[PDB]
Amino acid sequence: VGGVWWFFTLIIISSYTANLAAFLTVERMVSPIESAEDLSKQTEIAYGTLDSGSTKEFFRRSKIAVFDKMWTYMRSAEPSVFVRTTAEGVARVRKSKGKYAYLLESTMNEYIEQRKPCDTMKVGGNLDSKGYGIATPKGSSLGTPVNLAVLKLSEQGLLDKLKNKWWYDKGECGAKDSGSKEKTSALSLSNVAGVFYILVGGLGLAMLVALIEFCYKSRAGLFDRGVQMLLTTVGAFAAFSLMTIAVGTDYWLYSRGVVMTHSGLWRTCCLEGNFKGLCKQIDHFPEDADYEADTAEYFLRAVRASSIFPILSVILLFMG
Amino acid sequence: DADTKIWNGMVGELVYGKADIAIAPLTITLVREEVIDFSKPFMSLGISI
Amino acid sequence: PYVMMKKNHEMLEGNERYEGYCVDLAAEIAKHCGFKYKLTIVGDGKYGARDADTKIWNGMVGELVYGKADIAIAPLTITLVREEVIDFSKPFMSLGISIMIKKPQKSKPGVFSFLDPLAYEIWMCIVFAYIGVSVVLFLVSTNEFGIFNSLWFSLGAFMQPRSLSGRIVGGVWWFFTLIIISSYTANLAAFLTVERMVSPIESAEDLSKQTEIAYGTLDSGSTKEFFRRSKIAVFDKMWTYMRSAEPSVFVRTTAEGVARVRKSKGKYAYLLESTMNEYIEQRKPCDTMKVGGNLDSKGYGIATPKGSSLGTPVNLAVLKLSEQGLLDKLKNKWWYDKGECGAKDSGSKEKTSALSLSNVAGVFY
Amino acid sequence: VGGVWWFFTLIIISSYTANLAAFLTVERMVSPIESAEDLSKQTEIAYGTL
Numbered sequence: 001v002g003g004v005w006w007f008f009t010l011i012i013i014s015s016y017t018a019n020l021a022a023f024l025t026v027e028r029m030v031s032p033i034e035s036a037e038d039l040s041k042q043t044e045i046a047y048g049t050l051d052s053g054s055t056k057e058f059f060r061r062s063k064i065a066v067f068d069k070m071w072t073y074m075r076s077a078e079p080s081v082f083v084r085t086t087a088e089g090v091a092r093v094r095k096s097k098g099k100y101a102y103l104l105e106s107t108m109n110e111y112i113e114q115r116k117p118c119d120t121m122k123v124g125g126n127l128d129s130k131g132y133g134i135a136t137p138k139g140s141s142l143g144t145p146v147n148l149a150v151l152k153l154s155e156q157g158l159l160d161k162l163k164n165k166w167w168y169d170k171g172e173c174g175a176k177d178s179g180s181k182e183k184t185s186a187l188s189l190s191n192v193a194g195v196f197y198i199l200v201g202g203l204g205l206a207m208l209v210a211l212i213e214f215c216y217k218s219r220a221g222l223f224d225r226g227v228q229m230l231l232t233t234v235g236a237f238a239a240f241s242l243m244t245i246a247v248g249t250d251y252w253l254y255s256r257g258v259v260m261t262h263s264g265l266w267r268t269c270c271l272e273g274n275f276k277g278l279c280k281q282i283d284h285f286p287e288d289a290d291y292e293a294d295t296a297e298y299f300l301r302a303v304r305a306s307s308i309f310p311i312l313s314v315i316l317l318f319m320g
Numbered sequence: 321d322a323d324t325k326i327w328n329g330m331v332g333e334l335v336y337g338k339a340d341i342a343i344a345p346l347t348i349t350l351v352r353e354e355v356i357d358f359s360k361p362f363m364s365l366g367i368s369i
Numbered sequence: 370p371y372v373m374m375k376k377n378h379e380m381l382e383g384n385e386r387y388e389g390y391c392v393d394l395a396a397e398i399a400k401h402c403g404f405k406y407k408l409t410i411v412g413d414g415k416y417g418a419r420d421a422d423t424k425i426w427n428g429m430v431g432e433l434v435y436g437k438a439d440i441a442i443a444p445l446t447i448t449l450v451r452e453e454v455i456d457f458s459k460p461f462m463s464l465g466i467s468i469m470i471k472k473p474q475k476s477k478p479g480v481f482s483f484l485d486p487l488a489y490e491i492w493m494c495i496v497f498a499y500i501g502v503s504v505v506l507f508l509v510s511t512n513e514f515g516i517f518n519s520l521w522f523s524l525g526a527f528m529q530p531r532s533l534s535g536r537i538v539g540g541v542w543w544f545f546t547l548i549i550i551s552s553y554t555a556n557l558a559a560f561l562t563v564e565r566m567v568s569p570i571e572s573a574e575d576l577s578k579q580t581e582i583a584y585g586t587l588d589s590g591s592t593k594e595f596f597r598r599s600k601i602a603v604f605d606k607m608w609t610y611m612r613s614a615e616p617s618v619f620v621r622t623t624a625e626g627v628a629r630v631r632k633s634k635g636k637y638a639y640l641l642e643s644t645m646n647e648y649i650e651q652r653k654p655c656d657t658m659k660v661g662g663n664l665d666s667k668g669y670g671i672a673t674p675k676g677s678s679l680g681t682p683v684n685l686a687v688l689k690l691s692e693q694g695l696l697d698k699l700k701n702k703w704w705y706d707k708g709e710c711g712a713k714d715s716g717s718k719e720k721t722s723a724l725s726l727s728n729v730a731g732v733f734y
Numbered sequence: 735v736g737g738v739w740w741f742f743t744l745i746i747i748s749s750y751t752a753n754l755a756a757f758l759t760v761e762r763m764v765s766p767i768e769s770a771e772d773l774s775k776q777t778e779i780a781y782g783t784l
């Protein structure tokens with residue numbers, strides 16, 4: 001008994017260990033994206049652009065390898081991966097739990113990242129090289145002057161300064177970026193903690209049995225011997241009776257499918273809208289489920305045989 | 321607009337003498353460089369994720 | 370990889386002698402502007418500077434102002450000092466200053482590979498509960514009699530009649546340690562399967578916040594002069610460090626800088642133009658990588674003599690090429706396609722396995 | 735001594751078990767070429783034509 005029980009617990013603890021490893025192995029397998037090529041190599045995470053604009057027209061006309069496949073996907077992706085406005089796109093990313101990515105201008109993106117609730121971030125480098133500029137009527141007097149002015153401002157780092165002023169400084173967040181640093185990246189104390197509480201709980205239970213034990217010793221049971229036999233007999237009888245009640249519980253399983261189905265070993269029932277319930281008295285249940293499951297005969301019904309035997313054994317035991 | 325062949329927005333107000341200069345996040349595109357003049361980029365960008 | 374001498378350049382002549390990004394960019398510009406051309410290498414081999422004394426322009430920018438050439442197709446930076454003497458088309462390639470570090474390698478046992486799977490916080494609590502049980506058992510069983518017992522319960526602690534009280538304590542404590550050792554084993558297996566080795570963090574701000582990893586730039590150039598004149602918070606501190614860092618954090622040439630990064634085991638970072646950096650990353654032994662975004666916004670352009678006929682045409686040509694994605698295509702051709710290294714391919718390579726001694730050693734000590 | 739030696743062997747046998755699990759996990763990770771697309775997705779195995 002001690003040997004078989006040992007072999008039993010050996011298998012279980014081995015199973016627990018092995019199983020716990022797959023959940024940790026896969027937990028590491030997870031690799032967030034980072035580049036555009038990552039969006040094409042996978043399909044789990046949907047993605048799209050604005051329904052109208054240079055962004056969408058870019059992929060459509062792009063003859064580049066990666067961007068080509070991306071467009072092919074978005075072109076026939078269902079439901080529509082394209083949004084009406086930029087606000088809708090951001091909202092879709094914030095409500096998809098990371099299942100939807102949105103492609104937009106880096107400038108507007110970087111700004112969004114610095115806005116509450118600070119739940120969005122730009123990943124990887126840009127897909128193409130663009131640039132804004134000061135526009136002046138063809139053949140204007142301000143033409144050359146403004147041109148040089150822009151170059152002068154950039155070299156004085158005044159342009160970079162301005163951007164920092166309205167994008168990062170103006171924030172704000174300014175907090176959601178310091179937490180996005182991506183420091184942590186290991187296991188944790190959480191799971192292990194649950195095992196610590198059950199330990200202290202066991203220690204406390206023992207500290208209670210110690211005092212209790214002492215008290216008992218001091219006291220020193222004979223009363224129970226007389227009324228203990230009667231007590232134990234009626235407890236056994238009560239347990240047996242309830243076991244029989246449990247087996248017949250017109251509810252061994254409920255298979256919701258909104259109707260409502262509940263079954264035991266004898267009846268399969270259904271509650272229709274609204275409230276009316278009907279039952280198909282069949283009595284126990286081996287049927288044509290092609291189960292087998294590879295031997296011959298025994299179940300369904302096998303549970304019937306074990307329950308009936310249990311009650312017969314309990315009756316013989318109660319009597320004796 | 322392909323049909324009317326009319327420019328709209330800021331680029332429009334420049335070609336039709338409504339304004340003297342356009343200071344905004346105006347993208348430097350070939351289609352625009354033909355009708356107006358673009359100073360050197362004051363901010364380089366692109367498409368992101 | 371803008372303009373290089375072809376393999377059998379000795380058996381070739383004219384424009385066929387050269388190959389590269391700009392060599393292809395030249396043919397493209399010439400096709401959209403409609404003209405024949407003759408690729409020529411600048412004499413002094415410089416870009417475009419202006420000697421303060423003689424007030425003379427040198428390099429390509431020079432050959433343009435003095436009528437030696439009709440157009441300049443090269444990685445010529447668009448600067449204010451040059452825009453005054455010549456004409457720059459719109460940028461055909463935006464760039465900036467980037468950071469270069471060693472190859473995200475990995476290796477180190479320090480019995481600290483055993484405390485990692487199991488967090489330092491967890492090793493602590495498992496020790497607190499350890500003495501927390503040896504003290505509870507100690508209360509189950511005059512001053513020395515308590516010492517001999519505390520040493521006996523500490524031996525009942527150092528792990529391996531029917532006093533129900535302390536009995537369930539030994540059982541629960543056993544179930545507790547069972548879960549932990551099972552967790553350690555499972556977690557360590559995950560580690561031995563994936564085995565991913567990260568690295569530092571991309572952010573010039575990261576170079577200023579720390580000192581363990583030295584860093585510098587070229588002893589002479591716009592890169593160095595950038596930090597010196599930069600009034601930006603982060604870049605300011607960086608310059609202050611490099612300005613008085615000993616030994617010299619500045620290198621003579623770009624090759625020396627790269628060599629310093631490859632021979633410092635990740636203790637030295639080199640700051641250089643993103644363009645040249647990205648290219649280096651695609652060269653054997655593939656032990657360098659660019660981290661974080663650029664520090665500033667620059668851009669190369671096609672230079673043409675002030676008030677030239679090719680002025681407007683070339684300008685539009687550059688814009689046309691970029692919109693057709695031809696520029697991006699060319700870069701991919703010479704940087705990544707023609708490359709030799711690989712990053713997204715090294716992570717896509719699912720293969721590896723072997724036990725060492727490092728981790729196990731920590732448990733021996 | 736018996737306690738520390740026990741903790742020592744505990745770590746080792748745990749390491750052996752974990753590592754051995756990895757040698758079988760990776761052994762399954764390995765996939766063989768099934769189609770042409772497999773030749774393009776990898777580089778370890780060179781290939782060419784006439």
Ligand SMILES: O=c1[nH]c2cc(C(F)(F)F)c(N3CCOCC3)cc2n(CP(=O)(O)O)c1=O
Pocket residue numbers: 052053054055086104105107108345346347348
């Ligand atoms: O010259 C142009 N400059 C633009 C500048 C910006 C912004 F980044 F917000 F400054 C934007 N947005 C990006 C995000 O979605 C909301 C608006 C659109 C621009 N468009 C329209 P396109 O035809 O879609 O490129 C232009 O034409």
Ligand SMILES: O=c1[nH]c2cc(C(F)(F)F)c(N3CCOCC3)cc2n(CP(=O)(O)O)c1=O
Pocket residue numbers: 416417444445446589590591592623641642644645
């Ligand atoms: O017009 C210019 N174009 C340049 C183009 C390049 C390259 F990227 F290699 F094409 C470089 N390098 C970057 C890496 O270090 C080695 C040479 C320097 C350039 N410089 C000198 P700066 O004064 O330091 O900017 C110019 O003046």
